Amino acid sequence: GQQYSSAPLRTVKEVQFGLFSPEEVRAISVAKIRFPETMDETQTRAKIGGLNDPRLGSIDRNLKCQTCQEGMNECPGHFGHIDLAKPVFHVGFIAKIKKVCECVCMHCGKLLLDEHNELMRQALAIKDSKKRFAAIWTLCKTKMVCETDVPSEDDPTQLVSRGGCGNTQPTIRKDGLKLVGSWKKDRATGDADEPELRVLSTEEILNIFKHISVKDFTSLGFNEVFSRPEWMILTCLPVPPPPVRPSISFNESQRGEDDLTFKLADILKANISLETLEHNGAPHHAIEEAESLLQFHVATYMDNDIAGQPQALQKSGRPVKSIRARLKGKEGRIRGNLMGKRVDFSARTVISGDPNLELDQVGVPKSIAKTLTYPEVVTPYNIDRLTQLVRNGPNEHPGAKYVIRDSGDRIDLRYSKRAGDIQLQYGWKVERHIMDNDPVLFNRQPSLHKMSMMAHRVKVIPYSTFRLNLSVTSPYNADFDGDEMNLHVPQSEETRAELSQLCAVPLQIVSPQSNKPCMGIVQDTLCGIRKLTLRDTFIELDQVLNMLYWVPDWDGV
Amino acid sequence: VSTSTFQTRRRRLKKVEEEENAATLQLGQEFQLKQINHQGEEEELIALNLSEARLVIKEALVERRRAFKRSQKKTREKELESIDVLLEQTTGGNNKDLKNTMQYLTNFSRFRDQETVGAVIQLLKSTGLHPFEVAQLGSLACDTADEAKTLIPSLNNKISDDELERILKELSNLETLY
Amino acid sequence: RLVKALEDIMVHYDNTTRNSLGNVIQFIYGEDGMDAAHIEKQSLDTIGGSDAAFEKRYRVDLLNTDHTLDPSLLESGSEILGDLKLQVLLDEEYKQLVKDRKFLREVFVDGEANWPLPVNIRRIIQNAQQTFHIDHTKPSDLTIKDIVLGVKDLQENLLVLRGKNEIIQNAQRDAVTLFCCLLRSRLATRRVLQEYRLTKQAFDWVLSNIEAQFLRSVVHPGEMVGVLAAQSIGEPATQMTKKVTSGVPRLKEILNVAKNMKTPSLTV
Amino acid sequence: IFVYQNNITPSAMKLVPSIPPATIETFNEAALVVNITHHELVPKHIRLSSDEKRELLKRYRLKESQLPRIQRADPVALYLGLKRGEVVKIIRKSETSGRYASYRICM
Amino acid sequence: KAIPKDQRATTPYMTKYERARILGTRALQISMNAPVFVDLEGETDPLRIAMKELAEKKIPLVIRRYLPDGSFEDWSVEELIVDL
Amino acid sequence: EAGRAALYKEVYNVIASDGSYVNYRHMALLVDVMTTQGGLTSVTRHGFNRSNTGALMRCSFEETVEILFEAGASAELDDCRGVSENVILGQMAPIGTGAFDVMIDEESLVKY
Amino acid sequence: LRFGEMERDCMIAHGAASFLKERLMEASDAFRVHICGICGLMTVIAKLNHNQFECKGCDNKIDIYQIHIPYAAKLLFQELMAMNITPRLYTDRSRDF
Amino acid sequence: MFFIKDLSLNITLHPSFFGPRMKQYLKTKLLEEVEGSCTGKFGYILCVLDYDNIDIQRGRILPTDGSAEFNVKYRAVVFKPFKGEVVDGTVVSCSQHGFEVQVGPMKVFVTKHLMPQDLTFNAGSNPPSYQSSEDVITIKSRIRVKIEGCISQVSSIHAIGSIKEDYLGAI
DNA sequence: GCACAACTGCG
DNA sequence: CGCAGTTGTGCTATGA
Ligand SMILES: [Mg+2]
Ligand SMILES: [Zn+2]
Ligand SMILES: [Zn+2]
Ligand SMILES: [Zn+2]
Structure with a gap:
């Protein structure tokens, strides 16, 4: 598969969540990410030094990456950056940005309240990052003037000049992507009566956040190393590399760019409108116009499914798939790709009940047995047997599909000009057929039980169905009305141990759910066990003998 | 996989302010005067002067050769050829570094005999100088207190010009003759 | 929601029940520290019936002629009549059984006798009999001391928590409390001899099994009781088909911590 | 009061x-x-000394957070005049153990 | 921090989980051509070879039983009882 | 404490109604879990998903992105003590089989 | 086939830690990324041939580790970075408990 | 100079080695990896001290494969050069650009310019040399050099040195 | 199609 | 300053 790397192999012990500082975004970035045009060196098929591989990851499958070498299955993407023309909010933090504004003075960047207020020091005391901010906010949202002189911690006769600035504070209410405040004012003490109404610029808010004291934002949710409030407002944009937004290159001459590759081009275009718009003869209205648009493009790229309607619909009516939407539950990254997964070494078929199978076994069709494989390692113990299975080929029942050398290289017994003469060396792996008596995980969805997934013994059988013992129907919730079930094959000698030693059907016999057995004798057997056990019921020797023989443990008495 | 040390510090995200290292007695993080060991105790940094150095490797490779044969049960130019033998016995050969090191050490050792090395260490270690200076004084041969204070500029006001000279005088007397 | 709410809960190497925070949910899993599979609904015989029939069943009085154990029961019976030192032991024995009764009656207020507990004591004696071909005629070789004390000594070895300190030692005592009530119920001097008719050999075996069978019964540190419990409540909720909101929707109300519940009654 | x-x-x-x-x-x-405390469903709540608490946390290798919490406004906490940080030992009768000791730190 | 031998508290018996991972570990190791500390009495399945090893208590592994607080008690496959 | 009692009673009465029997310990755990925190913690997106548990763990139910957003916002640190985190990380979880570590002791490896 | 969320649950219930990792990694997603020891991000330029390992931005050429995570996680991570969030992966701890 | 540092390397043994000469193999594998090694952190790792007493520690068996990782705690003689460190060495190479001096395991180079003006290169010399009014520096020539700066390169450290100041140069 | 959680305004 | 009243917001079984 992937190649040897000298790098010390460890495990992720902690995950330290933080925020990107434009500085980092710049540093880590292998390219910027200047032109919306994907590739085609002016129609000439190969990537452009502008978007996707301006030193980023790679396309072509052949033709390795421009930063590391390795290529495709090895190379995780290499990050990019676009230097935004004007600071823009992060669609997500937009509410917290408002709440931070509501906490601090919009002029000197000092907390509206401090250690001088008792209900404030009470909140400043709260141990929890989130609960603390929540309490601070509730007290600070009420303060509409940055105090110059507060009454002393003893008398209201003498006043202490706690902090600078006297300025009146706005009443910030959001106007979707825009934060617009309404200041009280004064005018012969009266005003308001008719206040002052202006939108607060991303840049102004950013400048207030930059001036927020380490200790002040530290009292708020924030961290001086990983999450400074100023980092909620975006200046430098990380450009995710091809693997995040794959170019589905169907046939030779035909692209097929991902949704994100499109939305980025849109952010890029909108940024270049604004870039030149302001530098040149800035008609100052089309300036805040091209801005609101860039703010929209960066908003909908991260979240398209926002309150204030506009679905940023791809020219097809179909709305653009936001990154937020990608990770969003039951299907999509977290819920459906990580917590749940599609798996190799799995099988499914119709289940039919068998009276001649021991409780703990499962009838696996010959086809399924010949498809699914187990990686056995050439050991003096097996060696000879494995050579016979290799020799036998992938088409017989006991046989093998592949042989894996020391040189981690796969031999396809199915084709290999050597499948006949192939001398196995110890330590090689032989991916052989699911043979009788292997542990396997048998399963029936839904799966509300420890017992809805049990470990069975293989028994390779003819005919296309999975055959299971009737008594084990009850814990799966199976019936033979046309139900299908799943089979998972363990790959490790250690994993086989897990199933055998913990998940086995004989073990699962007495359920802790009810402190009573979960399987019993059922149907034909249950009806017949009464029918046989009545006093009126007697058996002649002829049948008594056959009935005795039939019990495999019979003592011959 | 590389090698790690007792120095357990955790610079989280905070890359740099990686100090320039000079004999302004500012050795690396790794080479701090105050440091730990496998036993978990604090211990003063170990610095060797050649010969005090040459004898360590000598000893270690000898006790190693003891075990290489224990488990296998069930005059300057003249010492040079003798050392090249011990290296062929206990070292991987691929370690051409230790060979060059031993040849250098053999020819550049100020004090041959151990008795002498022990006595050098007593003389210099009483001074209260930093281990890198107690090292440099034993390895570098000086006459003027100025010769010393120039090459080991870390001294300067640390020692008396006369007192440093008294040391240098006793060091030349100990100097094992070839 | 049930699984997602509990997933991270397991039994740690200190018989404690914690989550990813290591925040204690239960001090000892299911108040007793036993694996649910190793439980069987057993009868606490001490609990009910007349105080008169209780006395008949449990009381031994070597000082009274009509209330001693007949020398038909044990060999020692003839030489036991009047042993004041022994009547002291049978007095603790009886005064403890009397104590146990007042406790069970405090715990199970309705007088419910049948409770699910570990170690099927009924079956052990059953097997002791078939195993040692117990003669319900010839007198036992057991001593009053053999019984009384061997049972004392057994309880001491019925370990759930292990720690050497009052905090832990007292949690051991508590977690075990109810089982030993049943153990004392089934292993009273009169009961062991009259009913069971055990020999010393048979009795020692009964005890040895109870000990190791109990030990088997305890939870395994590593046991993923978060999901185990969540699945065990959730699963039967699937098989779900005065007039108060019941079943699936009431369960929905309970888990949701429904403020505006549908059928709120007060039973005065 | x-x-x-x-x-x-x-x-x-x-x-x-x-x-x-x-x-x-x-x-x-x-x-x-x-008297709320007299009720069927209300078990024995027992105030723990600085030293008693100290030992509980020592003995269970606990941090105050890890402990089950009783609110300051909890009827029984008010009845015993519980102060934040003060721990109670709760003795409930058990349908599995007979007697079960729980512990609650104050809010 | 590491609980000393004379202060261990955990079950002197082997957990259902311990035994399963112990057996799986030797089985994996045995299969990976590791050295076998028992007489293979014609045995050929690493699990059976491992079970035989565990039975003769000739498995050379140690269980680091971690406690909620982080500290641990090291127990040996030799010293652990197998009532299972 | 009386709320826990009434909560179990009510929970038990739902299960027992359908005839069905669930061993005490199970329903007791659910109840004990909803109880511990201090009051009645709802088995909902704004109840158990509130607690100080891992952000990668909580994101795996209900407010998925929003949780992860607020993670980086107030620089949360994942313990990776939770099952879910290990599942996301592809690591062997500290569950049953993974609740302890296994080591070869050279002393005993030379004894045999 | 699908080793769905629900199947993970019973597998945990079972205490089958290893069979779960095997299902979730080896029999699916399993992938190898290089991470920086300073900022725990997949920033590393793994020229694993000349053994060159670098995280420019961190100036690191020393503190690099290799981790095995599901490719869907590498993705989820790059996906979060694309959204200005840093999911820093660290191979040692600090907190305790 | 020449330090002694208490280091530790993590070695992952394959199961095939979980035999009796295990400690034996681990000790030898440490020496393979560790000796002759060169990091910019610790410099040249030259000799592993106290082979008899190497602390093996227990090795945790790795999750999905059978190999077990051990942290092999040790102590060794190390040479890490410093800028401003004065070293006595022997000349090796010598050209129009300067001369490269052998100091232990490492090579210090003195630029034509980092020498006095009186010392000038002799092209027409067998072997090549630098000639002062008084001194001659050719090959075997023992020298004293002030290390001006170090460059941590691959599995070696190199340096640029001075023989211009007082008490430096030919010895 | 609910059930709650923020938020907001009049007594 | 409090509580009625609203506006707001996220979820809605499991495999083909
Ligand atoms: Mg059906
Ligand atoms: Zn690349
Ligand atoms: Zn101000
Ligand atoms: Zn980095």
Whole structure:
């Protein structure tokens, strides 16, 4: 598969969540990410030094990456950056940005309240990052003037000049992507009566956040190393590399760019409108116009499914798939790709009940047995047997599909000009057929039980169905009305141990759910066990003998 | 996989302010005067002067050769050829570094005999100088207190010009003759 | 929601029940520290019936002629009549059984006798009999001391928590409390001899099994009781088909911590 | 302890923390008619000394957070005049153990 | 921090989980051509070879039983009882 | 404490109604879990998903992105003590089989 | 086939830690990324041939580790970075408990 | 100079080695990896001290494969050069650009310019040399050099040195 | 199609 | 300053 790397192999012990500082975004970035045009060196098929591989990851499958070498299955993407023309909010933090504004003075960047207020020091005391901010906010949202002189911690006769600035504070209410405040004012003490109404610029808010004291934002949710409030407002944009937004290159001459590759081009275009718009003869209205648009493009790229309607619909009516939407539950990254997964070494078929199978076994069709494989390692113990299975080929029942050398290289017994003469060396792996008596995980969805997934013994059988013992129907919730079930094959000698030693059907016999057995004798057997056990019921020797023989443990008495 | 040390510090995200290292007695993080060991105790940094150095490797490779044969049960130019033998016995050969090191050490050792090395260490270690200076004084041969204070500029006001000279005088007397 | 709410809960190497925070949910899993599979609904015989029939069943009085154990029961019976030192032991024995009764009656207020507990004591004696071909005629070789004390000594070895300190030692005592009530119920001097008719050999075996069978019964540190419990409540909720909101929707109300519940009654 | 008939004005309510280390308690006479602690479902709550608490945390290799919490306003916590940080031992009868000891740290 | 041998508290018996991972570990190791500390009495399945090893208590592994607080008690496959 | 009692009673009465029997311990755990925190913690997106548990763990139910957003916002640190985190990380979880570590002791490896 | 969320649950219930990792990694997603020891991000330029390992931005050429995570996680991570969030992966701890 | 540092390397043994000469193999594998090694952190790792007493520690068996990782705690003689360190060495190479001096395991180079003006290169010399009014520096020539700066390169450290100041140069 | 959680305004 | 009243917001079984 992937190649040897000298790098010390460890495990992720902690995950330290933080925020990107434009500085980092710049540093880590292998390219910027200047032109919306994907590739085609002016129609000439190969990537452009502008978007996707301006030193980023790679396309072509052949033709390795421009930063590391390795290529495709090895190379995780290499990050990019676009230097935004004007600071823009992060669609997500937009509410917290408002709440931070509501906490601090919009002029000197000092907390509206401090250690001088008792209900404030009470909140400043709260141990929890989130609960603390929540309490601070509730007290600070009420303060509409940055105090110059507060009454002393003893008398209201003498006043202490706690902090600078006297300025009146706005009443910030959001106007979707825009934060617009309404200041009280004064005018012969009266005003308001008719206040002052202006939108607060991303840049102004950013400048207030930059001036927020380490200790002040530290009292708020924030961290001086990983999450400074100023980092909620975006200046430098990380450009995710091809693997995040794959170019589905169907046939030779035909692209097929991902949704994100499109939305980025849109952010890029909108940024270049604004870039030149302001530098040149800035008609100052089309300036805040091209801005609101860039703010929209960066908003909908991260979240398209926002309150204030506009679905940023791809020219097809179909709305653009936001990154937020990608990770969003039951299907999509977290819920459906990580917590749940599609798996190799799995099988499914119709289940039919068998009276001649021991409780703990499962009838696996010959086809399924010949498809699914187990990686056995050439050991003096097996060696000879494995050579016979290799020799036998992938088409017989006991046989093998592949042989894996020391040189981690796969031999396809199915084709290999050597499948006949192939001398196995110890330590090689032989991916052989699911043979009788292997542990396997048998399963029936839904799966509300420890017992809805049990470990069975293989028994390779003819005919296309999975055959299971009737008594084990009850814990799966199976019936033979046309139900299908799943089979998972363990790959490790250690994993086989897990199933055998913990998940086995004989073990699962007495359920802790009810402190009573979960399987019993059922149907034909249950009806017949009464029918046989009545006093009126007697058996002649002829049948008594056959009935005795039939019990495999019979003592011959 | 590389090698790690007792120095357990955790610079989280905070890359740099990686100090320039000079004999302004500012050795690396790794080479701090105050440091730990496998036993978990604090211990003063170990610095060797050649010969005090040459004898360590000598000893270690000898006790190693003891075990290489224990488990296998069930005059300057003249010492040079003798050392090249011990290296062929206990070292991987691929370690051409230790060979060059031993040849250098053999020819550049100020004090041959151990008795002498022990006595050098007593003389210099009483001074209260930093281990890198107690090292440099034993390895570098000086006459003027100025010769010393120039090459080991870390001294300067640390020692008396006369007192440093008294040391240098006793060091030349100990100097094992070839 | 049930699984997602509990997933991270397991039994740690200190018989404690914690989550990813290591925040204690239960001090000892299911108040007793036993694996649910190793439980069987057993009868606490001490609990009910007349105080008169209780006395008949449990009381031994070597000082009274009509209330001693007949020398038909044990060999020692003839030489036991009047042993004041022994009547002291049978007095603790009886005064403890009397104590146990007042406790069970405090715990199970309705007088419910049948409770699910570990170690099927009924079956052990059953097997002791078939195993040692117990003669319900010839007198036992057991001593009053053999019984009384061997049972004392057994309880001491019925370990759930292990720690050497009052905090832990007292949690051991508590977690075990109810089982030993049943153990004392089934292993009273009169009961062991009259009913069971055990020999010393048979009795020692009964005890040895109870000990190791109990030990088997305890939870395994590593046991993923978060999901185990969540699945065990959730699963039967699937098989779900005065007039108060019941079943699936009431369960929905309970888990949701429904403020505006549908059928709120007060039973005065 | 102050057993007020109908109500206390927010005027007087602010005078309760004014005189520490002395602590004042307010109780509506109407709540006190019935002793909540006597109820079927209400088990034994036991105040633990600084040393008693210290040992519990030592013995279970605990941090105060890890412990199950009783709110400051918990009827039984008010009954015993629980202060934040103070731990209670809860002795409930068990349908599995007979007797079960739980512990609650204050809020 | 590491609980000393004379202060261990955990079950002197082997957990259902311990035994399963112990057996799986030797089985994996045995299969990976590791050295076998028992007489293979014609045995050929690493699990059976491992079970035989565990039975003769000739498995050379140690269980680091971690406690909620982080500290641990090291127990040996030799010293652990197998009532299972 | 009386709320826990009434909560179990109510929970038990739902299961027992359908005839069905669930061993005490199970329903007791659910109840004990909803109880511990201090009051009644709802088995909902704004109840158990509130607690100080891992952000990668909580994101795996209900407010998925929003949780992860607020993670980086107030620089949360994942313990990776939770099952879910290990599942996301592809690590062997500290569950049953993974609740302890296994080591070869050279002393005993030379004894045999 | 699908080793769905629900199947993970019973597998945990079972205490089958290893069979779960095997299902979730080896029999699916399993992938190898290089991480920086300073900022725990997949920033590393793994020229694993000349053994060159670098995280420019961190100036690191020393503190690099290799981790095995599901490719869907590498993705989820790059996906979060694309959204200005840093999911820093660290191979040692600090907190305790 | 020449330090002694208490280091530790993590070695992952394959199961095939979980035999009796295990400690034996681990000790030898440490020496393979560790000796002759060169990091910019610790410099040249030259000799592993106290082979008899190497602390093996227990090795945790790795999750999905059978190999077990051990942290092999040790102590060794190390040479890490410093800028401003004065070293006595022997000349090796010598050209129009300067001369490269052998100091232990490492090579210090003195630029034509980092020498006095009186010392000038002799092209027409067998072997090549630098000639002062008084001194001659060719090959075997023992020298004293002030290390001006170090460059941590691959599995070696190199340096640029001075023989211009007082008490430096030919010895 | 609910069930709650923020938020907001009049007594 | 409090509580009624609203506006707001996220979820809605499991495999083909
Ligand atoms: Mg059906
Ligand atoms: Zn690349
Ligand atoms: Zn201000
Ligand atoms: Zn980095």
